[PDB]
Design a binder for this molecule. Structure first.
Ligand SMILES: *[C@@H]1O[C@H](CO)[C@@H](O[C@@H]2O[C@H](CO)[C@@H](O[C@@H]3O[C@H](CO[C@H]4O[C@H](CO)[C@@H](O)[C@H](O)[C@@H]4O)[C@@H](O)[C@H](O)[C@@H]3O)[C@H](O)[C@H]2NC(C)=O)[C@H](O)[C@H]1NC(C)=O
Ligand SMILES: *[C@@H]1O[C@H](CO)[C@@H](O[C@@H]2O[C@H](CO)[C@@H](O[C@@H]3O[C@H](CO[C@H]4O[C@H](CO)[C@@H](O)[C@H](O)[C@@H]4O)[C@@H](O)[C@H](O)[C@@H]3O)[C@H](O)[C@H]2NC(C)=O)[C@H](O)[C@H]1NC(C)=O
Ligand SMILES: *[C@@H]1O[C@H](CO)[C@@H](O[C@@H]2O[C@H](CO)[C@@H](O)[C@H](O)[C@H]2NC(C)=O)[C@H](O)[C@H]1NC(C)=O
Ligand SMILES: *[C@@H]1O[C@H](CO)[C@@H](O)[C@H](O)[C@H]1NC(C)=O
Ligand SMILES: *[C@@H]1O[C@H](CO)[C@@H](O)[C@H](O)[C@H]1NC(C)=O
Ligand SMILES: *[C@@H]1O[C@H](CO)[C@@H](O)[C@H](O)[C@H]1NC(C)=O
Ligand SMILES: [Ca+2]
Ligand SMILES: [Ca+2]
Ligand SMILES: [Ca+2]
Ligand SMILES: [Ca+2]
Ligand SMILES: [Ca+2]
Ligand SMILES: [Ca+2]
Ligand SMILES: [Ca+2]
Ligand SMILES: [Ca+2]
Ligand SMILES: [Ca+2]
Ligand SMILES: [Ca+2]
Ligand SMILES: [Ca+2]
Ligand SMILES: [Ca+2]
Lengths: 417, 418
């Protein structure tokens, strides 16, 4: 059990234990009387004359992991009679070494609004202990982010791999105008971090946030019916790096899409617009590499079409017909003529006024009618009408907007009670 | 009815009526034989000698509203024997006149962000018909506002009085930079607007909206512990007119209020601030006329106190004591020293790091302890401790922030296994 013949053997011993202790008692048989220890003794392992193998110094896995020893039996004369046989000492590991970061100071940089979770810098540390045991198994962690807005982490670190990346929130909020420069303190721990007794090292990471010039531009307003020569530049986008191939992606599949994009990222309008066909547009600008692989998120472009006065007022019909009783007196409501304008509601482009131009016949007098200037309502201006005297009136009404006029024809039929 | 003794009476007749019938037959007993009509006859009202009172053409309430007539009975000689008595003709009104605006074009202006509902311009119209009847009772109304942003009315009009003012939304969103200049078309209707037969007039109203320079300034950042001469200008407010009386109002009603305002509207900090007693301030700037009237709403002032590193790290107590057993081996965790810094959390001002300076005694050797640079945790660095070789260690730990260093003292008592 702690004694026995010379045969191949392996013992496993913890390093860093008190330089006492026996390993094993080897047993003789005549003609053999003494024993000899050779190999990687490293002035640590010793055999007594009569078979007692032991070590006299602390072992160290880090200086040497396995000791390859040989034990021979000698006869009384001093000649080898058994062996040598190999005795193997496996030095079992303890956590006697602190992890060390390969640099005390790190620098990285990351583009604003880059994919969260993507490595931009690695911090690497090592531990001289056994990677196949807690003792040499490392766990990284952010100690502080400086500066820090409202307890919100803009960076994170992969607890195993040492990869530093932006969080969701960093991708989104990190702005080099507000804050171009961040310090991270990183801690590494052995024992996979899972012990209060683990050994720790720290290091410093300076991070520069580089500019992103790929952003959604300001909403565009374009006047319809452009009298100017086309195409016209209306907005632009720029990829961070040169060489990109620019597309425009039209989200509805419109009949004519009157915007396109050139190779510098300039967005042009091809044609005149018409408010009256098409009020507004949304589409996307996309950046490509030489390979046809999208470079980033697409960009939302908005075009508002401003109205011009490019439709005149129209008549509700070739002749609009109203009937009035003779028993009706000064100020009767007769009817409302409502002309239409295709230009933009509630603007001066579509805001009609009304004037009576002609009245035939003028009997018994002219001016028997008024039309309310904006409501378009016809009232009797003077007296009652008399079917006996004239059965019917024909009015020419001038409907006009800001800079167009239109003539519309109204018939007033006189009826009895 | 239609006949009776000569007595005071009152009849009511529509204007614009061509007469078809007499008004009344007055009867008198002998000695009375004929009758006489006097007063406001306007060569319209007539009495026949035989007592027959009537009118001879259309009346007009606008030319005359009440006719005050007298009828007397006469004798064969021509002497009065009854009366004269008052006969009253009330001319009942009809809606034969359009309302008219006194001007076809109106011009006004209003200061941006002024009191909504407050008249700045009056449009007046008149109607010759009877105020006491729908026929001469006027109703104003906006036809259109040009331009109009997102179907939102920036102006309104008092339907009776003709007063034009800003709506709530005009007060708030009207921006003279984007758009200083608005047209209103205003309609007036008789019949109190309630009839589709009413008569209408319209007018044009041109409005310029003047700029408001009375606005809340951008929030201020002021460093604490200013070494500069006080008071220090930090922001400003301006009323639209000169002669405003600028004041400051502290809501928190603090013991020490370290801001002031001068008569130009300039806002000062009066003293050094200290983040560590007081982090931020809010107060209000107020404008008054020379009698004490809030020239307008108060203005909200925000002062953020920026931190400087002006407190050094502190010790959790003069001596911090931990106990270690002899059976504790390399790397066993002993204890955590947590120093304090009053400066701003989660900044470099308060971010402590730890170094062991001294270990006494150095027996059996120096360097038996390490401290985790930021966690402040003491671990055994080399070997076990032995009460035989000293019952106690004394460590001097240098706690330092960005600019200051402080020595804190840790005592390790070596004790027996249990
Ligand atoms: C760019 O602006 C042009 C205006 O300079 C736009 O042309 C207008 O197009 C509308 C719709 O097609 C036409 O409206 C028609 O109006 C006629 C009566 O028009 C009469 O009025 C004008 C006097 O202003 C006179 O020039 C003519 O002799 C006509 O007698 C109605 O019968 C129809 O129902 C219809 O409403 C306009 O007439 C036309 N104006 C002109 C000057 O050509 C053009 O569409 C704009 N383009 C875009 C694409 O936005
Ligand atoms: C403006 O800045 C001033 C200086 O930066 C601030 O003065 C500080 O006031 C605090 C407490 O009110 C003091 O902190 C005390 O520190 C001692 C230990 O002090 C030793 O170390 C300091 C710094 O190196 C050294 O100067 C001394 O000689 C000492 O040997 C503790 O025992 C206290 O509890 C407390 O922490 C600072 O001592 C003092 N610093 C200085 C450099 O004068 C001032 O209060 C600031 N005012 C505002 C309005 O912000
Ligand atoms: C009112 O307008 C109508 C429509 O044009 C007139 O009637 C036309 O009169 C012409 C000759 O003047 C005839 O040849 C047509 O047969 C009529 N058209 C129709 C369909 O009735 C009418 O004359 C006008 N009346 C007045 C009093 O102006
Ligand atoms: C770090 O560096 C060492 C070489 O000295 C290498 O063997 C190791 O694989 C590297 N680790 C990481 C996490 O990239
Ligand atoms: C380390 O990272 C993985 C996620 O990648 C996570 O599941 C695990 O919980 C983390 N370890 C600790 C101790 O947080
Ligand atoms: C006009 O305003 C009065 C109060 O001034 C209000 O009571 C009345 O309802 C309004 N009339 C209409 C038609 O809204
Ligand atoms: Ca070792
Ligand atoms: Ca280790
Ligand atoms: Ca080891
Ligand atoms: Ca058009
Ligand atoms: Ca139009
Ligand atoms: Ca148009
Ligand atoms: Ca009249
Ligand atoms: Ca009247
Ligand atoms: Ca009237
Ligand atoms: Ca302070
Ligand atoms: Ca401070
Ligand atoms: Ca500090």
């Amino acid at each position: 059990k702690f004694s026995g013949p010379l045969k191949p053997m392996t013992f496993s011993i913890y390093e860093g234990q008190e330089p006492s202790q026996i390993i094993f008692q080897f047993k003789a048989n005549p003609p053999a009387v003494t024993f000899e220890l050779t190999g990687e003794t490293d002035n640590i392992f010793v055999i007594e004359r009569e078979g007692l193998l032991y070590y006299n110094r602390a072992l160290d896995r880090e200086t040497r992991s396995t000791h390859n020893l040989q034990v021979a039996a000698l006869d009384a004369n001093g000649i080898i009679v058994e062996g040598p046989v190999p005795i193997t000492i496996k030095v079992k590991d303890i956590n006697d070494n602190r992890p060390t970061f390969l640099q005390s100071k790190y620098e990285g940089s990351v583009r604003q609004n880059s994919r969260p979770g993507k490595p931009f810098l690695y911090v690497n540390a090592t531990d001289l202990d056994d990677p196949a045991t807690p003792n040499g198994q490392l766990y990284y962690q952010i100690v502080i982010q400086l500066p820090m807005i409202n307890n919100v982490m803009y960076f994170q670190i992969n607890n195993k791999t040492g990869a530093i990346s932006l969080t969701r929130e960093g991708s989104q909020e990190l702005n080099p105008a507000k804050n171009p420069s961040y310090n991270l303190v990183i801690s590494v721990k052995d024992m996979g971090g899972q012990s209060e007794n683990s050994f720790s090292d720290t290091t410093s990471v300076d991070i520069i946030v580089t500019e992103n010039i790929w952003k959604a531009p300001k909403p565009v307003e374009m006047v319809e019916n452009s009298t100017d020569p086309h195409p016209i530049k209306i907005t632009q986008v720029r990829w961070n790096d040169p060489g990109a191939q620019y597309s425009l992606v039209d989200k509805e599949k419109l009949p004519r899409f009157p915007f396109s994009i050139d190779q510098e990222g300039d967005i042009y309008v091809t044609q005149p617009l018409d408010r009256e066909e098409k009020d507004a547009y949304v589409f996307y600008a996309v950046a490509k590499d030489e390979y046809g692989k999208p470079l980033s998120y697409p960009l939302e472009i908005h075009v508002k079409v401003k109205d011009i006065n490019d439709n005149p007022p129209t008549c509700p019909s070739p002749v609009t017909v109203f009937e009035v009783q003779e028993n009706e007196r000064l100020g009767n409501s007769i009817g409302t003529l409502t002309a239409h304008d295709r230009d933009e509601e509630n603007t001066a482009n579509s805001f009609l006024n009304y004037r009576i131009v002609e009245q035939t016949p003028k009997l018994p007098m002219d001016g028997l009618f008024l039309i309310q200037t904006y409501a378009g309502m016809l009232q009797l201006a003077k007296q009652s009408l008399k079917k006996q005297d004239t059965p019917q009136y024909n009015l020419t009404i001038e409907v006009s907007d800001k800079d167009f006029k239109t003539l519309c024809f109204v018939q007033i039929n006189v009826i009895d009670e």
